[PDB]
Write a protein that holds these residues in place. Structure first.
Motif, PDB file in Angstrom:
ATOM      1  N   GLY A 144      19.030  22.403  66.398  1.00 61.91           N
ATOM      2  CA  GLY A 144      18.248  23.166  65.448  1.00 61.91           C
ATOM      3  C   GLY A 144      18.800  23.224  64.044  1.00 61.91           C
ATOM      4  O   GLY A 144      18.117  23.711  63.140  1.00 61.91           O
ATOM      5  N   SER A 145      20.028  22.744  63.838  1.00 62.28           N
ATOM      6  CA  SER A 145      20.595  22.686  62.495  1.00 62.28           C
ATOM      7  C   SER A 145      19.874  21.669  61.619  1.00 62.28           C
ATOM      8  O   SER A 145      19.596  21.950  60.447  1.00 62.28           O
ATOM      9  CB  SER A 145      22.085  22.363  62.577  1.00 62.28           C
ATOM     10  N   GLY A 146      19.556  20.498  62.162  1.00 60.42           N
ATOM     11  CA  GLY A 146      18.807  19.511  61.411  1.00 60.42           C
ATOM     12  C   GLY A 146      19.635  18.482  60.679  1.00 60.42           C
ATOM     13  O   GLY A 146      19.385  18.230  59.495  1.00 60.42           O
ATOM     14  N   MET A 147      20.627  17.888  61.338  1.00 62.18           N
ATOM     15  CA  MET A 147      21.332  16.771  60.735  1.00 62.18           C
ATOM     16  C   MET A 147      20.432  15.537  60.716  1.00 62.18           C
ATOM     17  O   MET A 147      19.500  15.427  61.517  1.00 62.18           O
ATOM     18  CB  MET A 147      22.619  16.452  61.493  1.00 62.18           C
ATOM     19  N   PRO A 148      20.676  14.600  59.795  1.00 61.73           N
ATOM     20  CA  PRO A 148      19.881  13.361  59.789  1.00 61.73           C
ATOM     21  C   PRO A 148      20.070  12.497  61.027  1.00 61.73           C
ATOM     22  O   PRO A 148      19.227  11.629  61.284  1.00 61.73           O
ATOM     23  CB  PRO A 148      20.354  12.639  58.518  1.00 61.73           C
TER      24      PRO A 148
ATOM     25  N   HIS B 257      28.862  10.230  59.625  1.00 64.38           N
ATOM     26  CA  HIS B 257      27.846   9.551  60.432  1.00 64.38           C
ATOM     27  C   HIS B 257      28.358   9.427  61.864  1.00 64.38           C
ATOM     28  O   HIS B 257      28.931   8.410  62.254  1.00 64.38           O
ATOM     29  CB  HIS B 257      27.494   8.190  59.830  1.00 64.38           C
ATOM     30  N   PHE B 258      28.124  10.467  62.655  1.00 66.63           N
ATOM     31  CA  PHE B 258      28.576  10.533  64.034  1.00 66.63           C
ATOM     32  C   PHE B 258      27.449  10.170  65.010  1.00 66.63           C
ATOM     33  O   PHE B 258      26.257  10.264  64.695  1.00 66.63           O
ATOM     34  CB  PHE B 258      29.216  11.903  64.281  1.00 66.63           C
ATOM     35  N   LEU B 259      27.851   9.744  66.217  1.00 62.78           N
ATOM     36  CA  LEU B 259      26.981   9.090  67.196  1.00 62.78           C
ATOM     37  C   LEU B 259      26.250   7.881  66.617  1.00 62.78           C
ATOM     38  O   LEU B 259      26.864   6.827  66.437  1.00 62.78           O
ATOM     39  CB  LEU B 259      26.019  10.091  67.851  1.00 62.78           C
ATOM     40  N   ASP B 260      24.953   7.988  66.345  1.00 68.41           N
ATOM     41  CA  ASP B 260      24.196   6.815  65.894  1.00 68.41           C
ATOM     42  C   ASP B 260      23.419   7.098  64.606  1.00 68.41           C
ATOM     43  O   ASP B 260      22.531   7.953  64.562  1.00 68.41           O
ATOM     44  CB  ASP B 260      23.314   6.264  67.023  1.00 68.41           C
ATOM     45  N   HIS B 261      23.789   6.379  63.547  1.00 67.02           N
ATOM     46  CA  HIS B 261      23.131   6.485  62.245  1.00 67.02           C
ATOM     47  C   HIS B 261      23.480   5.277  61.377  1.00 67.02           C
ATOM     48  O   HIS B 261      22.597   4.592  60.859  1.00 67.02           O
ATOM     49  CB  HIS B 261      23.529   7.781  61.528  1.00 67.02           C
TER      50      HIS B 261
END
Lengths: 977, 276
Positions: free
Chosen positions: A934-938, A872-876
């Motif tokens: 464009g990969s589409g991580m949550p 969970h990188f940056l904000d999640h």
């Protein structure tokens, strides 16, 4: 879902019902691991029992045909392969005549197995663009093969075993002082003897040493250009004439202080070991238009109807279609909505007009549209939700404007997408026919409308057309990050000064944001500037390949910059983002795909990760077809390595199946019975043969060998990852590593971990280059599929939770580091721990990864600190890696005081220098995080997320203010520090 | 209004980032605008965000010699005077290609009427209720999404199985056609030589082949019916998520509006954080 439909492992007794060409049916009890040739043998032995044996012909003239689990009638010229690996759908085998070339079909089977989907539906798909790409990409495939075979057998050795170097021939000052007068003590391990006996020599040579002279004084000390240097323990070779310290193995030995050890092997041995790549030329390669600008009309598109929309009738009243002409992420005109028809009958028959002209349409213009649903009878606020989305390229690959009817199959809404339209999504219809389909109609202009070539654009240029005092504004715009607050004042200043922008090459991404692409003259003028633009650095060049710059000439300039500046090592570092921006290409055939394939077919180290990055997202149906075609191309033109890749795939899928029968069948019982079932499943011979003697996907140089069954286990984590331990077939490889530990983790997506570790490695590189020995431990991680991948394990390292549990407190970690390595090397361990802690603290604060506990952070015996399970990188803003007192004690050398500690002051200085270094190089990080959308991580969909790393790096504030920002963040972490 | 401080202005928003500005300028009509502090965070910038052509155009206001203006020269005393002047007169004076009027301001006073029961404990309890309701709605939406993805994988696998079944039918019908081809003109030899044992065993072989192909027909038809049923369930799950989604978005908007109102009302953030 394994070796049979609905049966994971077939029983030892298998009743095959083969099909005879004469017309008879047999019921044959077939051996469990039987090969196909003997199956045909006692097929024809009992064929005499049944009638019409006279019409039967010899065994060798007949071939098995069967339907596999991937819905295609596979025919089997490969009789040496066992029935277990054949992947039967039903146990039947028709016996017929040859119908095609044997080598072509065996290669097709290998390619389809490596990709995971058959080449047959690539042949049977009737899209002209797909077939044209399949025909035309073979040209660059052949050119890459010819360049690979240009200086045989030396160039073949270069392709199979490329030099693992980095970009800079020179060395940073903080490691040149790490050597005694710039000398590297190197050990050369000659095994060449009448017996298989090892022996060694020690050489004190320079850092700019070509391997040719390295072996020259090797032979001189032995007491001549036919020997090569191979790194002990892996398949890394020192081939091309380079400085010795430039190689990544030698550089890493300088980093960690480990003793460099090398082979001394004959050139002829490796040249005979490497085979000749039989690049068979594929069979399918055998198989009054007015200009765009002469049309005086406005662009209109007719929405006919939708065949069915998955929406409830008593919860949603009306639905409509929101459209819009986009150029990347920004609209070329105002979005147009259809009439809110009732959701029961999505029938429109409505023309939609746009505030744009036919000549004003840019080359990369796309019609982005979405069926959406309205709401809001209760309350005065009405909301629109996305319901189905789809994008159409207004110009196809043949530069022709779309016309006539078009049945576009819409795509499901991306998870967490608030936006009504999805311009970042891929183009083209959904291959799934069980999707909402919309009939579009583009206006017919009584002919075929074609985009003008470069001649008409250049003639339009120079027709609509002393240095100024204030040139510092251009530099100021250049130095800001790609996601800066660019004004219409700055846009107009950029466009009015576009001719003077050529003296600052790195302002081109901003200038392309200044030009409005809905204007024909501005597009032609900006094309004229692009054509004569000076080349830019690769870090700036890959910025022009994201979704913000869809123009084919802009992307062509970026690809040319990648051709003419980008090196193989930086390509390997940036291979993830360059693979991910292939989805941003509107056409299958472009310059970026040619560049990536040409570099992948001349470099096995690059091509291996290229294949795996494409393979890890074949589950994504949005890019399944394009990446499947590219994987077909790579597997056709890679040569022998395909077989190796096949082996890897076998192991991976076997592991996948094992994890499957670990996670949805027996997730309830205790761990010990699970371990018993583990050793029973892995002890079986075909699992061994799949898991023995294959190249590691994490590192193609590390050739995995014997599998130690005694220590392959499962950790106590949530998803139960699988620990694997492999031997090395070479017997004297104890120098580097005697073991290869790999975590096969399925269930948790590892694209996040891959991106985090790549970024961490890049921060490590920047810190090492600037003058800080801020070593990270970016362990090898490679996602292989849908939330399944591999993780390289760090040997002799334990989590902080394990250290705290084994010691028993706050002083237990410093006590453990005191006990593990005391004496004169205790100071080195303390400095290593403090410095790695400073670097990882800076990296974790900037990236903003998930909350850190003692379970997901590890420390080595030598004192090196590193982080695992990022996720969970940056904000999640939230600093996750608050410096706990467990680290305060170790940094302060066990001192109770922490505020007035001199080593803590040096820790501050290292952290501040790291933060300033990453702030200076933040353009690269913003570029890499923007290329990954464009990969589409949550937690990575739009630039709203990248605003987090924008804020943590304080790019909006001045360079000075970031210092006090970091002060305040660390003081809030320490409650005063 | 002749002249008013920008703090009391409806269009001015103060200290916010570009992201919430884009969220509040999302799919709105032409001319929709607001004024916020620039991201550089120094006093006197007060940038303007307008929407034109579906794009969030952003304009800078300068603060030379205590005045304001879009560009040189600066002929406005305050930002409010400039906003009113470009609210009554088109912005084409600065740039003729930006033929747009400043029609609709993004007023922070508009969302004040959404929240009721202005006392602190009432809005705290209301925020708690809408936040937890958003929690069950979100967990329902994620469970439905998980079920949708699993059923989509089942549809893909079942469709692959059906296609394999159709190709198996093609294989076995080709076998039966070849059996008829090599048996139609050759059973006359059986009639001349007159042996009934070979006739009965070849008819037994044909009968068991017919039984096998009929069983494969039965399996294909059963799995096709199962695919139709499971696709109907797939459609129902997709419809259920599409019903939940506007409600979840509305709960998100309500929670965000309540949190913003509490933040601008001076309510302690830590006192409300741990209620959740």
């Amino acid at each position: 879902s394994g070796e049979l439909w609905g049966i994971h492992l077939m029983p030892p007794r298998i009743l095959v019902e083969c099909l005879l060409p004469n017309g008879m049916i047999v019921t044959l009890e077939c051996l469990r691991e039987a090969t196909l040739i003997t199956i045909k043998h006692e097929l024809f032995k009992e064929a005499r029992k049944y009638p019409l044996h006279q019409l039967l012909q010899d065994e060798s003239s007949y071939i098995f045909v069967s339907v596999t689990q991937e819905a295609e009638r596979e025919e089997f010229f490969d009789e040496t392969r066992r029935l277990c690996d054949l992947r039967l759908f039903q146990p039947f085998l028709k016996v017929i005549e040859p119908v095609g070339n044997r080598e072509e079909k065996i290669l097709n089977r290998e390619i389809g197995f490596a990709i995971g989907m058959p080449v047959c539906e690539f042949d049977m798909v009737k899209d002209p663009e797909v077939q044209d790409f399949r025909r035309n990409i073979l040209n660059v495939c052949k050119e890459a093969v010819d360049l690979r075979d240009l200086n045989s057998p030396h160039s073949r050795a270069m392709y199979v075993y490329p030099p693992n170097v980095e970009s800079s021939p020179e060395l940073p000052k903080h490691i040149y002082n790490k050597l005694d007068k710039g000398q590297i003590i190197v050990v050369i391990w000659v095994i060449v003897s009448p017996n298989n006996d090892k022996q060694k020599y020690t050489l004190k040579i320079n850092h700019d040493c070509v391997p040719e002279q390295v072996i020259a004084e090797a032979i001189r000390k032995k007491t001549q250009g036919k020997y090569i240097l191979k790194v002990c323990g892996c398949d890394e070779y020192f081939l091309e004439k380079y400085p010795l310290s430039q190689y990544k193995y030698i550089r890493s030995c300088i980093m960690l202080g480990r003793m460099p050890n090398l082979m001394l092997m004959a050139k002829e041995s490796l040249y005979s070991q490497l085979p000749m790549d039989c690049f068979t030329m594929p069979s399918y390669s055998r198989r009054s238009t007015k200009s765009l600008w002469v049309i005086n009309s406005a662009l209109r598109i007719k929405i006919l109807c939708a065949t069915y929309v998955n929406v409830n009738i008593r919860d949603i009243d009306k639905i409509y279609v929101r459209t819009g002409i986009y150029h990347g992420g920004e609209p070329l005109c105002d979005n147009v909505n259809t009439q809110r028809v009732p959701c029961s009958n999505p029938r429109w028959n409505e023309w939609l007009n746009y505030d744009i002209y036919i000549p004003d349409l840019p080359r990369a213009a796309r019609l982005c549209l979405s069926i959406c649903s309205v709401k809001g009878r209760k309350g005065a606020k009405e909301e629109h939700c996305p319901l189905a989305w789809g994008n159409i390229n207004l110009f196809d690959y043949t530069d022709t404007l779309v016309s006539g009817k078009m049945a576009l199959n819409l795509w499901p809404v991306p998870h967490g997408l608030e936006d009504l339209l999805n311009p970042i999504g891929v183009t083209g219809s959904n291959p799934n026919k069980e999707t909402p389909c919309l009939e579009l109609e583009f206006d017919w202009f009584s002919s075929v409308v074609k985009f003008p070539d470069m001649s008409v654009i250049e003639e339009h240029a120079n027709w609509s057309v002393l240095r100024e005092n204030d040139k510092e504004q251009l530099k100021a715009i250049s130095t800001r990050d790609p996601l800066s607050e660019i004004t219409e004042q700055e846009k107009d200043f950029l466009w009015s000064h576009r001719h003077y922008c050529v003296t600052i090459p790195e302002i081109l991404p901003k200038l392309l944001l200044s030009v409005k692409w809905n204007s024909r003259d501005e597009v032609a003028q900006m094309y004229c500037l692009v054509k004569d633009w000076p080349p830019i650095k690769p870090e700036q060049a890959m910025e022009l390949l994201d979704c913000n710059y869809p123009d084919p000439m802009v992307r062509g300039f970026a690809v040319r910059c990648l051709e003419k500046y980008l090196t193989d090592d930086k390509l390997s570092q940036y291979l993830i983002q360059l693979v991910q921006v292939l989805k941003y290409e509107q056409y299958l055939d472009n310059l970026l795909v040619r560049f990536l394939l040409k570099k992948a077919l001349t470099n096995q180290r690059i091509g291996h990760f290229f294949f795996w990055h494409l393979k890890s997202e074949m589950h994504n149906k949005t890019v399944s077809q394009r990446f499947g075609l590219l994987l077909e191309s790579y597997c056709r033109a890679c040569g022998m390595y395909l077989k190796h890749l096949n082996r890897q795939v076998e192991a991976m899928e076997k592991l996948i199946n094992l994890t499957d029968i670990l996670k949805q069948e027996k997730k309830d019982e205790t761990q010990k019975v699970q371990m018993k079932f583990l050793v029973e499943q892995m002890r079986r011979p075909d699992f061994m043969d799949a898991l023995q003697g294959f190249l590691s996907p994490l590192n193609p140089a590390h050739q995995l060998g014997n599998l130690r069954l005694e220590e392959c286990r499962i950790m106590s984590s949530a998803k139960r990852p699988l620990w694997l331990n492999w031997e090395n077939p070479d017997i004297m490889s104890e120098l580097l590593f005697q073991n290869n530990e790999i975590i096969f983790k399925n269930g948790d997506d590892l694209r996040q971990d891959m991106l985090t570790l790549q970024i961490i490695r890049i921060m490590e590189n920047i810190w090492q280059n600037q003058g800080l020995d801020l070593r990270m431990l970016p362990y090898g991680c490679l996602s292989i599929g849908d939330c399944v991948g591999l993780i390289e394990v760090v040997r002799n390292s334990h989590t902080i939770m394990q250290i705290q549990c084994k010691g028993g407190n706050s002083h237990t970690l410093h006590q453990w580091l005191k006990d593990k390595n005391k004496g004169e090397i205790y100071d080195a361990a303390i400095d290593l721990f403090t410095r790695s802690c400073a670097g990882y603290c800076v990296a974790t604060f900037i990236l903003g990864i998930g909350d850190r506990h003692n379970s997901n952070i590890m420390v080595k015996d030598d004192g090196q600190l590193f982080h695992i399970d990022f996720g969970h990188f940056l904000d999640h803003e939230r600093v996750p890696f608050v410096l706990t007192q467990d680290f305060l004690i170790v940094i302060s050398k066990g001192a109770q005081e922490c505020t007035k500690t001199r080593e803590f002051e040096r820790f501050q200085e290292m952290c501040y220098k790291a933060y300033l270094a990453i702030r200076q190089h933040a353009n690269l990080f913003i570029n890499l995080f923007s290329m990954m959308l464009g990969s589409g991580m949550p937690e990575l969909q739009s630039f709203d997320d990248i605003a987090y790393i924008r804020k943590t790096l304080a790019l909006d504030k001045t360079e000075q203010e970031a210092l006090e920002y970091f002060m305040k963040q660390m003081n809030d972490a320490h409650h005063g520090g | 209004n002749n002249n008013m401080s920008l703090q009391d202005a409806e269009w001015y928003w103060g200290d916010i980032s570009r992201e919430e500005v884009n969220e509040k300028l999302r799919d709105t009509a032409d001319g929709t605008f607001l004024v916020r502090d620039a991201s550089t965070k120094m006093h006197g910038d007060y940038t303007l965000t307008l929407r034109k052509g579906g794009n969030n155009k952003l304009i800078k206001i300068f603060h030379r010699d205590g005045k304001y203006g879009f560009s040189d020269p600066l002929t406005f005393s305050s930002v409010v005077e400039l906003i009113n002047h470009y609210r009554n007169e088109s912005l084409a004076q600065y740039n003729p290609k930006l033929d747009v009027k400043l029609l609709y301001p993004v007023s922070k006073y508009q969302q004040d009427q959404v929240v009721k029961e202005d006392n602190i404990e009432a809005v705290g309890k209301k925020l708690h209720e809408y936040n937890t309701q958003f929690q069950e709605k979100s967990r329902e939406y994620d469970r439905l999404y998980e079920e949708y993805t699993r059923t989509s994988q089942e549809i893909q696998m079942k469709r692959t199985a059906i296609e394999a079944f159709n190709e198996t039918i093609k294989i076995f019908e080709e076998q039966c056609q070849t059996q008829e081809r090599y048996s139609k003109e050759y059973i006359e030899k059986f009639k001349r030589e007159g042996n009934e044992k070979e006739i009965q065993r070849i008819m037994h072989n044909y009968d068991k082949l017919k039984s096998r192909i009929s069983e494969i027909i039965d399996s294909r038809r059963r799995l096709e019916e199962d695919l139709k049923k499971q696709a109907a369930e797939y459609r129902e799950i997709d419809k259920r998520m599409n019903s939940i989604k506007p409600d979840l978005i509305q709960l998100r908007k309500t929670r965000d509006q309540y949190l913003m109102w509490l933040t601008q009302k001076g309510v302690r953030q830590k006192k409300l954080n741990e209620w959740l």
